[PDB]
Design a protein around this ligand. Structure first.
Ligand SMILES: COc1ncccc1NC(=O)N1CC[C@H](C(N)=O)C1
Ligand SMILES: [Zn+2]
Length: 140
């Protein structure tokens, strides 16, 4: 589990969105595994607007942050899970790192800010849904 809190937005994995998220919906995209809902309180996270390919992510199944090198956002085939059939997910970045299903939502960040959230993994890989192209998260 986990979210990004930027401005009056809450960014979560679409497959983990709550009823309150759906009832306060701003934007969602199944192909990216992302959903954004509106918040009453202002958040403290800032979004990175950069080209970093190295950063650090939070792994809840280890209670630890790990440094990683990750690929550029791309269209990657993701195995079936209880939430989606086997399919291509867009804007996904892969790295070598530990992950388990419940690790979705952990933040990946660089020196510029938040880059994305854990969205996929297995067998010593971890994948992150990029948010750096979503420029509208910085306004409203
Ligand atoms: C961190 O994810 C994992 N970690 C280990 C094995 C398997 C996984 N993957 C998952 O549980 N899913 C749930 C939905 C998600 C997606 N399609 O974006 C992939
Ligand atoms: Zn950066």
């Amino acid at each position: 589990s986990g979210a990004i809190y930027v401005g009056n937005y809450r960014v979560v994995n679409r497959h983990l969105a709550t009823h309150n998220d759906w009832a306060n919906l701003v934007w969602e995209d199944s192909s990216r595994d992302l959903l954004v809902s509106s918040t009453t309180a202002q958040g403290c996270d800032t979004i990175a607007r950069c080209d970093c390919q190295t950063g650090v992510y939070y792994c809840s199944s280890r209670r630890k942050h790990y440094p990683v090198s990750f690929s550029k956002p791309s269209l990657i085939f993701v195995e079936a899970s209880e939430y989606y059939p086997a399919r291509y997910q867009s804007h996904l970045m892969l790295a070598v790192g530990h992950s388990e299903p419940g690790d979705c939502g952990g933040i990946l960040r660089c020196q510029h800010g938040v880059v994305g959230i854990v969205s996929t993994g297995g067998n010593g890989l971890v994948g992150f849904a990029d948010v750096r192209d979503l420029l509208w998260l910085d306004e409203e």
